Amino acid sequence: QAVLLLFRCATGEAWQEIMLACLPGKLCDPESDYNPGEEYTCGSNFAI
Amino acid sequence: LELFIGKMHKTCFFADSDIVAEEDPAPCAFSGNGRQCTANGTECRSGWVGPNGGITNFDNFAFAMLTVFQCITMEGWTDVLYWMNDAMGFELPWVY
Amino acid sequence: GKFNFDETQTKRSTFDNFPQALLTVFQILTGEDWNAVMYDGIMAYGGP
Amino acid sequence: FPSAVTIKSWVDKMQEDLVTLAKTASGVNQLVDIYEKYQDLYTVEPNNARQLVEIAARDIEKLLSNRSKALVRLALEAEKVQAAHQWREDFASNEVVYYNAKDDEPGSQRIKPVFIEDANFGRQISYQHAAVHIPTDIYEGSTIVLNELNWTSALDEVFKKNREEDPSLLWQVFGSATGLARYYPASPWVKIDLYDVRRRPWYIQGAASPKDMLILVDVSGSVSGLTLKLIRTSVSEMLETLSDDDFVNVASFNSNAQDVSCFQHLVQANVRNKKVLKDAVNNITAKGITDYKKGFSFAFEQLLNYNVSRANCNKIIMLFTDGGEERAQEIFNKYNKDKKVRVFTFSVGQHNYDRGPIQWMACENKGYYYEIPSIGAIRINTQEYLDVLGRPMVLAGDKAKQVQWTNVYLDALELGLVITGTLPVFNITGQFENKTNLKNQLILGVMGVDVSLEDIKRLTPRFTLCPNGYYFAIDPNGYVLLHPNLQPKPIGVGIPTINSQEPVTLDFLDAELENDIKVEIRNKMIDGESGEKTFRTLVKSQDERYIDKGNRTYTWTPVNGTDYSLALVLPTYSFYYIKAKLEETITQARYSETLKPDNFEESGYTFIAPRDYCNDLKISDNNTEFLLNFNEFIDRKTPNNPSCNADLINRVLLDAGFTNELVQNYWSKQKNIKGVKARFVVTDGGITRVYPKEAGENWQENPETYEDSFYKRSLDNDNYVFTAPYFNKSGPGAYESGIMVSKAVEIYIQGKLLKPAVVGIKIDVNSWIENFTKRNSDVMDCVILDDGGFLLMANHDDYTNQIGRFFGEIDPSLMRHLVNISVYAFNKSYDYQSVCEPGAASKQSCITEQTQYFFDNDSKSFSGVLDCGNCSRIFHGEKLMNTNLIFIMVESKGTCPCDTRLLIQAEQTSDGPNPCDMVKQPRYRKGPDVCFDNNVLEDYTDCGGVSG
Ligand SMILES: *[C@@H]1O[C@H](CO)[C@@H](O[C@@H]2O[C@H](CO)[C@@H](O[C@@H]3O[C@H](CO)[C@@H](O[C@@H]4O[C@H](CO)[C@@H](O)[C@H](O)[C@H]4NC(C)=O)[C@H](O)[C@H]3NC(C)=O)[C@H](O)[C@H]2NC(C)=O)[C@H](O)[C@H]1NC(C)=O
Ligand SMILES: *[C@@H]1O[C@H](CO)[C@@H](O[C@@H]2O[C@H](CO)[C@@H](O[C@@H]3O[C@H](CO)[C@@H](O)[C@H](O)[C@H]3NC(C)=O)[C@H](O)[C@H]2NC(C)=O)[C@H](O)[C@H]1NC(C)=O
Ligand SMILES: *[C@@H]1O[C@H](CO)[C@@H](O[C@@H]2O[C@H](CO)[C@@H](O)[C@H](O)[C@H]2NC(C)=O)[C@H](O)[C@H]1NC(C)=O
Ligand SMILES: *[C@@H]1O[C@H](CO)[C@@H](O[C@@H]2O[C@H](CO)[C@@H](O)[C@H](O)[C@H]2NC(C)=O)[C@H](O)[C@H]1NC(C)=O
Ligand SMILES: *[C@@H]1O[C@H](CO)[C@@H](O[C@@H]2O[C@H](CO)[C@@H](O)[C@H](O)[C@H]2NC(C)=O)[C@H](O)[C@H]1NC(C)=O
Ligand SMILES: *[C@@H]1O[C@H](CO)[C@@H](O[C@@H]2O[C@H](CO)[C@@H](O)[C@H](O)[C@H]2NC(C)=O)[C@H](O)[C@H]1NC(C)=O
Ligand SMILES: *[C@@H]1O[C@H](CO)[C@@H](O)[C@H](O)[C@H]1NC(C)=O
Ligand SMILES: [Ca+2]
Ligand SMILES: [Ca+2]
């Protein structure tokens, strides 16, 4: 799935829209192990 | 045409109604393989015009001609791919 | 003037006048969202 | 086929087989003996139809004079308090404190109240402060809203002061032009909230004077698409700001100007006419070129008609377009050079056309300019035209401070049917020296105080009148402020076909059966002249199944306080009434003992009418516990009745002794009768009794005597009345109840006729069959119908199974012939307040057509032959004496193989009457005589675009 996403960006489909979706203020799926009391933490400023 | 024809025709309406549940509908599974709308008040069956109002589908040679030429210019080709991961599984469409 | 079939939104890439039709042709020339304009042209003449 | 002579004798035999049983078992003449032989426990008092209406009108006028003083005391203080406001722009330090409705802040602090429950208020209220409602689309905490919450905080003291003088005061509300509404007492607000005080009918009438609108819709090609959907929604939203006093018409133009509907001129803009316009506006298509000259000539010609009834007030044109380059200066110069007509222009949609000419038309003709780019702008921009129309109203001064009253509408806070007083509030800051005068030509807001229709009904008592007598009040428009047939439901229009903000405006001619003599009575009431008239009507029964004719007398006078007119309907035999006169102890205590449920074994199952004797005894609307509450109240209280009237209590107590003297001395002697299943007496006092206590379980009648359909039918008729049981197994009524027969008792005291009670029996259906036969014949049919064509007896054991059914639903060929040969007449009516089942294109409200049948001719012997086609059936109908029954004998329907369409007499959903031809000859009405427009001191220099 990650490789297909990069192939999507290689052709330039909505690569700027994907980048905006990876900024820090994003929800994390419950399957991940994260400390309680913080939900919108995953995502990094390195997405730019 | 051979791998798939008329598959993108099952979107999820509301129960006992003819109103599409979501504002930007996407197909369900053809036969229990792709995507199912899990919303409680909705169920999906046949009777949908299509993803782009009927323009984007593979149910005719003229339509198949137009959809493929759209994907060969790399403009809106993931939308056709993503509508297939809903209509059928994730295994077949990505190769095509 | 044939892009007024939606009755729920205002299309911005139209051919209403020469300055706007000149921008739409330029946008199709770059290839960005050229299919979205094509769908409007098809739906303006009856549909699929 | 038996001869006429021999069949006459057969039906003649059944006449005294039924009448004698009902004359003896019920005891019609015995109750008359009881009433006449005393003549000392009661007195016959005159019931003057002129003095009653005079008294009631003055009480109603005084009620609306209580409220007019409250409105003046509130509007006067609001102007003074607002004039001393400083308009600061920082409330973070000096925070405002108030209670906001619909709650569980830069410069606002909230209040948590106590909300104790109270009577005459179906909610929880608090008298300690006032509640403030702010619409969702309006952000509280802005400079405009916060500045409004200061000078409106001084209204609470006046709110409390008004309630102290008049405790029986309902909602008193201030509707601001900023949007917020502050009402007293505080109460939480009642899906999402869409209430706006500025769009309410009571706010709109006080914001301006009536108007003659003419909406021009641009339907040229360029408006096709989104900007046409916006226009259609904008026109429908502006029609909601109109009432029965405004006249409107909608026209469209695209190279040709034409009407969008069937009206062709200005119409009254009531709930039905506006539905026609709204339907037509939602069906217009965009095509062609734009022609403002032809569109404005058509609009200006329709405002000069003067064949038709108009408002003779503000004449305005609302142009709904997008843009263009035509100014049509020649048309404006020709048609209004003296600026007698305002022009309001709207630029609707997302476009980049030229708005210059559109703005020029706005203030060249004393209008204002609006922009509606999206759906969110429709709600507010279509109500801002009332700011311009109120400019001459504020320049008039104190002569424009007149209290007006709305139509009947359902209160927003779930209080019932109410009317509202109205008074505008002016901005008089700097008016002492007259130095600003720029923002002072707009109203601050509209005052309001609510009056319940139940308050009006308390001033017109009806328990001294016959159950057939009633009051009713009228409006200059013809609508009824007061009527027995007015119900707390919205009035429906058309057919509801889907895959309560309107007023309940019921016309007088639609409240009851319309007649050529009521129309002249209605017109005489509308223009306010007192009079009286005695004449023969035909009256629809309480249950819409029967129609009977009787003498009626209408006495009306105008109420000088307002524009209302009050009338009292009083039949004959009711100009006198029985007034109980007894103050002795033991003669009243014994009568009270007859109400005890444990005494029902010998005194019969006794009911009692849930009447408001006085406050500490509250009605229960079931009579299972009200009787226990009532009889344990009188004994556990001083008999002198210190706090409430004995007239309503002495009457019911007096009739307890009278009915008991009939049940004990006469009904107890004959414990059982073969042809009798029950024995009932219903009295004017409000008590009904059934001698077999086990037969009291089958009683389906209303415990309130005045609401009993069979009681009212018996008084009008001079003979026995047969009541048909309901069909469709609506409870147990087929065989275990019986057939109701009743007859009113008539007594003479000093030569004055009185009808205090009705008596009757429930004849057993099974016993009637045995006498009727002395059966299931395949050749001859024998059925008995009552006045109304309802089956009561039969000769097949199959028709009897479907008892109490309209004879047109079981034998359409014979029933239809009886109408044509003038045996049964029928009047058709429309019911505008009824539950209605939706149809394909819960329940909604629509119009249902009601039809009732009654005896046309006075002849009794009927005979003839029915020609259904290639066959022949001969009949003979004879009517029984001293009753409303008819006996008809026909051959079996199987002989002639014809079964035509069945004749239906039931609640039929309809959409009539047609309003296209109603407006050609509209009912007479009188409009307001005060008109505030065309003031020379008006500024109108801010066209619509000073800020853009
Ligand atoms: C009854 O009528 C009186 C006048 O007859 C009226 O009182 C006047 O109220 C206005 C505000 O509604 C005051 O206006 C002051 O001056 C300007 C006008 O807006 C404001 O400055 C900015 O102006 C821009 C204009 O584009 C505006 O967008 C902005 O919001 C304003 N404020 C800013 C930038 O902070 C002043 O702030 C405003 N207030 C002052 C100076 O305190 C008049 O001064 C008032 N005149 C008098 C004589 O009192 C009163 O509101 C009317 N009653 C009602 C209920 O409306
Ligand atoms: C809009 O808000 C204003 C600010 O809160 C209110 O004005 C303030 O009201 C206070 C209560 O009456 C005043 O306090 C006292 O006022 C008396 C009367 O003149 C004086 O003794 C003093 O000013 C003061 N007493 C003290 C401090 O011991 C405030 O003076 C007054 N003004 C301010 C705070 O600037 C308005 O009342 C309110 N609008 C309305 C209509 O009430
Ligand atoms: C949506 O999912 C289910 C319904 O499909 C809800 O869970 C319960 O499902 C049963 C089975 O039909 C219902 O009878 C219950 O009423 C449902 N709710 C309960 C038990 O609280 C689930 O709650 C729904 N999610 C919502 C409404 O947010
Ligand atoms: C409304 O006002 C009128 C007149 O102002 C009242 O008419 C009075 O009628 C009585 C007899 O019906 C006359 O004796 C009086 O002379 C009349 N009044 C005057 C001023 O001449 C009428 O009574 C008033 N309505 C009510 C309900 O009181
Ligand atoms: C009603 O309005 C019309 C114009 O809208 C007036 O014009 C008259 O129309 C009638 C019918 O043809 C005729 O009398 C004449 O043709 C018109 N002129 C006159 C002087 O009558 C009409 O006068 C208005 N009033 C009435 C009562 O019809
Ligand atoms: C209600 O009563 C009867 C229903 O049958 C009708 O009145 C009669 O109408 C016929 C036909 O026009 C006339 O010949 C009779 O003279 C009428 N009876 C009268 C005037 O007593 C009609 O449907 C209604 N009557 C009204 C509206 O007056
Ligand atoms: C209110 O109206 C009544 C009549 O209904 C009258 O008697 C009274 O004086 C009026 N005023 C007050 C304060 O009650
Ligand atoms: Ca692209
Ligand atoms: Ca145009």
Q: Comparing C-alpha atoms, which of D349, D300, D378 is closest to residue D358?
A: D349
Distance from CA of C19 to the nearest CA of D (A): 13
Other beta carbons within 10 Å of D486: 19
Ligand 6 in reach of D124 Cβ (< 6 A) = no
Q: Comparing C-alpha atoms, which of D622, D672, D671, D611 is closest to residue D644?
A: D611
With vertex at residue D648, the alpha carbon angle to CA D643 and CA D650, rounded to the nearest 5 degrees, is: 95
Name all chains with 3 or more CB-CB pairs below 8 Å to chain A: B
Which residue carries 């000259």 as its tokens?
D293
User: D897 CA distance to ligand 6 centroid (A)?
Assistant: 34
Q: Comparing C-alpha atoms, which of D346, D331, D261 is closest to residue D301?
A: D331
- Residue D870 DSSP label: S
Q: Comparing C-alpha atoms, which of D647, D579, D580 is closest to residue D611?
A: D647
Give the C-alpha separation, D351 to D321, whole Å.
Answer: 11
**DSSP H or E run through D827:** strand D824-831
Q: Which residue of D221, D224, D350 is in closest CB contact with C10?
A: D350
| A15 token code pair | 């690569």
| D560 token code pair | 């000088």
Pairing of strands B10-14, D121-125: unpaired
Which residue has its alpha carbon closest to ligand 7 atom 10?
A: D66
Q: Comparing C-alpha atoms, which of D336, D302, D335 is closest to residue D213?
A: D302
| D304 token code pair | 């000069």
| D646 token code pair | 């004995």
Q: Comparing C-alpha atoms, which of D421, D52, D379, D393 is closest to residue D233?
A: D379
Helix (H, G, I), strand (E, B) or coil at D407: coil
With vertex at residue B3, the alpha carbon angle to CA B2 and CA B8, rounded to the nearest 5 degrees, is: 105
Give the C-alpha separation, D796 to D800, whole Å.
Answer: 7
Give the C-alpha separation, D152 to D144, whole Å.
Answer: 12
Give the C-alpha separation, D819 to D873, whole Å.
Answer: 16
Amino acid at D863: S
Give the C-alpha separation, D431 to D84, whole Å.
Answer: 11
D355 Rama class: left (phi>0) / alpha (psi -120 to 50) / beta: alpha
- List, in order, residues 6 or more apart from D743 with CB less than 8 Å away: D22, D26, D28, D714, D719, D720, D721, D758, D759, D760
Other beta carbons within 10 Å of D727: 17
Minimum CA–CA partner of B62 in chain C: C48
| D544 token code pair | 């819409």
| D112 token code pair | 């948590």
| D274 token code pair | 């506006």
Contact D553, D568 (CB under 8 A): no
The CA distances from residue D563 to D146, D313, D688, in Å, are 39, 19, 41
- Residue D115 DSSP label: -
User: A35 CA distance to ligand 3 centroid (A)?
Assistant: 28
**Bond prior to D185 in cis (omega within 30° of 0):** yes
Distance from CA of residue D402 to its chain's centroid?
26
Other beta carbons within 10 Å of D287: 12
- List, in order, residues 6 or more apart from D259 with CB less than 8 Å away: D249, D250, D251, D252
Contact D370, D345 (CB under 8 A): yes
Amino acid at D700: Q
D257 Rama class: left (phi>0) / alpha (psi -120 to 50) / beta: beta
Question: What are the strands, taking DSSP E only, across D499-597?
Answer: 531-540, 547-558, 565-571, 576-580
Give the C-alpha separation, D801 to D32, whole Å.
Answer: 38
Which residue has its alpha carbon closest to ligand 7 atom 11?
A: D66
Name all chains with 3 or more CB-CB pairs below 8 Å to chain D: C
Discontinuities in chain D (C→N > 2.5 Å), after residue:
104, 190, 499, 774, 841
| D466 token code pair | 């016959």
Provide residues with CB under 6 Å of ligand 1. D 87, 89, 427, 429-430, 436, 438-440, 444
Give the C-alpha separation, A29 to D545, whole Å.
Answer: 68
Q: C31–B54: do the CB atoms touch at under 8 Å?
A: no
| D307 token code pair | 């064949």
Helix (H, G, I), strand (E, B) or coil at D665: helix
Q: Comparing C-alpha atoms, which of B36, B66, B65, B49 is closest to residue B6?
A: B49
Q: Comparing C-alpha atoms, which of D17, D493, D96 is closest to residue D271?
A: D493
| D711 token code pair | 């009681």
Which one of the ligands is nearest to D358 CA?
9
Contact B59, C16 (CB under 8 A): no
Contact D107, D96 (CB under 8 A): yes
Other beta carbons within 10 Å of D112: 8
Distance from CA of C45 to the nearest CA of B (A): 13
Which one of the ligands is nearest to D516 CA?
6
Amino acid at D930: V
Q: Which backbone phi and psi does D183 adopt, to 5 degrees?
A: -125, 160
Other beta carbons within 10 Å of D271: 17
**DSSP H or E run through C41:** helix C34-43
Helix (H, G, I), strand (E, B) or coil at D522: helix
Give the C-alpha separation, D276 to D270, whole Å.
Answer: 10
Question: Residues of A with CB below 8 A from B77's CB?
Answer: 11, 13
Other beta carbons within 10 Å of B95: 6
Q: Comparing C-alpha atoms, which of D373, D384, D380 is closest to residue D229?
A: D373
Helix (H, G, I), strand (E, B) or coil at B28: coil
Pairing of strands D181-184, D172-176: antiparallel
Give the C-alpha separation, B8 to B54, whole Å.
Answer: 9
Q: Which residue of B54, B63, B75 is in closest CB contact with C35?
A: B75
Q: Which of D59, D560, D564, D565 to mutate to test the pocket of ligand 4 (most atoms within 8 A of CB)?
A: D560
Counted residue by residue, chain C has a size of 48
CA atoms within 13 A on the CB side of D669: 8
Helix axes D647-662, D586-593, angle to 10 degrees: 70
Give the C-alpha separation, A2 to D351, whole Å.
Answer: 44
Helix (H, G, I), strand (E, B) or coil at D270: coil
SS (H, E, C) D150-212: HHCCCHHHHHHHHHHHCCCCCCEEEEECCCCEEEECECCCCCCCCCCHHHCHHHHHHHCCCEE
With vertex at residue D159, the alpha carbon angle to CA D154 and CA D162, rounded to the nearest 5 degrees, is: 135
SS (H, E, C) D904-928: CCCCEEECCCCCCCCCCCCCCCCCC
Distance from CA of residue D209 to its chain's centroid?
26
- Residue A32 DSSP label: S
Helix (H, G, I), strand (E, B) or coil at A20: helix
D285 CB within 8 Å of a chain C CB:
no
Q: Comparing C-alpha atoms, which of D926, D930, D65, D928 is closest to residue D479?
A: D926
Which residue carries 């933490």 as its tokens?
A41
Give the C-alpha separation, D211 to D12, whole Å.
Answer: 68
Give the C-alpha separation, D756 to D464, whole Å.
Answer: 11
Helix (H, G, I), strand (E, B) or coil at D848: strand
Q: Comparing C-alpha atoms, which of D226, D258, D272, D274 is closest to residue D375?
A: D226
Name all chains with 3 or more CB-CB pairs below 8 Å to chain B: A, C
Helix (H, G, I), strand (E, B) or coil at D651: helix
Give the C-alpha separation, D897 to D871, whole Å.
Answer: 9
Strand partners, D183: D131, D173
Give the C-alpha separation, B32 to B36, whole Å.
Answer: 8
Asked whether the CA dihedral D470, D471, D477, D478 is positive or negative, the reply is positive
CB-neighbour burial class of residue D325 (10 A; exposed 0-12, middle 13-18, buried 19+): exposed
Contact D97, D109 (CB under 8 A): yes
Give the C-alpha separation, D440 to D83, whole Å.
Answer: 11
Ligand 5 in reach of D305 Cβ (< 6 A) = yes
With vertex at residue D466, the alpha carbon angle to CA D463 and CA D469, rounded to the nearest 5 degrees, is: 95
Contact D521, D471 (CB under 8 A): no
Give the C-alpha separation, D405 to D385, whole Å.
Answer: 22
DSSP sequence for D471-503: EEEE-TTSBEEE-TT--SSPPP-S-------S-
| D5 token code pair | 């002579």
- List, in order, residues 6 or more apart from D35 with CB less than 8 Å away: D658, D745, D747, D756
**Bond prior to D913 in cis (omega within 30° of 0):** yes
Give the C-alpha separation, D541 to D536, whole Å.
Answer: 16
Pairing of strands D116-118, D688-690: unpaired
D226 CB within 8 Å of a chain C CB:
yes
Which residue has its alpha carbon closest to ligand 7 atom 3?
A: D62
The CA distances from residue D668 to D27, D591, D657, D839, in Å, are 12, 18, 15, 55
- List, in order, residues 6 or more apart from D509 with CB less than 8 Å away: D478, D518, D519, D522, D923
Q: D225–C9: do the CB atoms touch at under 8 Å?
A: no
Give the C-alpha separation, D137 to D140, whole Å.
Answer: 10
First to last CA, chain D: 94
Q: Which of D439, D442, D444 to mutate to test the pocket of ligand 1 (most atoms within 8 A of CB)?
A: D439
Give the C-alpha separation, D298 to D785, whole Å.
Answer: 60
Which residue has its alpha carbon closest to ligand 5 atom 1?
A: D307
Minimum CA–CA partner of A12 in chain B: B74
Contact D896, D873 (CB under 8 A): yes
- Residue D296 DSSP label: H
Strand partners, D344: D318
Helix (H, G, I), strand (E, B) or coil at D888: strand
A8 CB within 8 Å of a chain B CB:
yes
Strand partners, D471: D568
Contact D866, D893 (CB under 8 A): no
Other beta carbons within 10 Å of A1: 6
**DSSP H or E run through D516:** helix D516-526
Q: A13–B77: do the CB atoms touch at under 8 Å?
A: yes
Q: Helices marked H in D243-328 — which ranges? A: 271-281, 292-302
Q: Comparing C-alpha atoms, which of D866, D871, D903, D686 is closest to residue D789?
A: D903
Give the C-alpha separation, A12 to A21, whole Å.
Answer: 16
Distance from CA of B76 to the nearest CA of C (A): 7
Contact D559, D566 (CB under 8 A): yes
Give the C-alpha separation, D397 to D314, whole Å.
Answer: 18
DSSP sequence for D24-70: HHTTHHHHHHHHHHH-SSEEEEE--HHHHHHHHHHHHHHHHHHHHHH
Q: Comparing C-alpha atoms, which of D400, D401, D403, D408 is closest to residue D64?
A: D403
**DSSP H or E run through D647:** helix D647-662
Contact D92, D141 (CB under 8 A): no
Distance from CA of A20 to the nearest CA of B (A): 18
Other beta carbons within 10 Å of D613: 20
Contact D850, D828 (CB under 8 A): yes
Contact A30, A13 (CB under 8 A): no
Q: Which backbone phi and psi does D357 adopt, to 5 degrees?
A: -60, -35
Would you say D450 is a known binding-site residue? no
Asked whether the CA dihedral D915, D921, D923, D928 is positive or negative, the reply is positive
Give the C-alpha separation, D460 to D471, whole Å.
Answer: 7
CB-neighbour burial class of residue D265 (10 A; exposed 0-12, middle 13-18, buried 19+): middle
CB-neighbour burial class of residue D449 (10 A; exposed 0-12, middle 13-18, buried 19+): buried
Give the C-alpha separation, D545 to D247, whole Å.
Answer: 38
The CA distances from residue D802 to D766, D855, D901, in Å, are 14, 23, 18
The CA distances from residue C48 to B78, B80, D563, in Å, are 21, 17, 65
Q: Comparing C-alpha atoms, which of D754, D667, D692, D682 is closest to residue D721?
A: D682
Contact B79, B87 (CB under 8 A): no
Q: Comparing C-alpha atoms, which of D314, D111, D93, D21 is closest to residue D935?
A: D314
CA atoms within 13 A on the CB side of D875: 26
- List, in order, residues 6 or more apart from D542 with CB less than 8 Å away: D707, D708, D709, D712
| D572 token code pair | 């004959």
SS (H, E, C) D204-250: HHHHCCCEEEEEEEECCHHHCCHHHHHHHHHHHHHHHHCCCCCEECE
Give the C-alpha separation, D279 to D238, whole Å.
Answer: 14
Which residue carries 């005393």 as its tokens?
D38
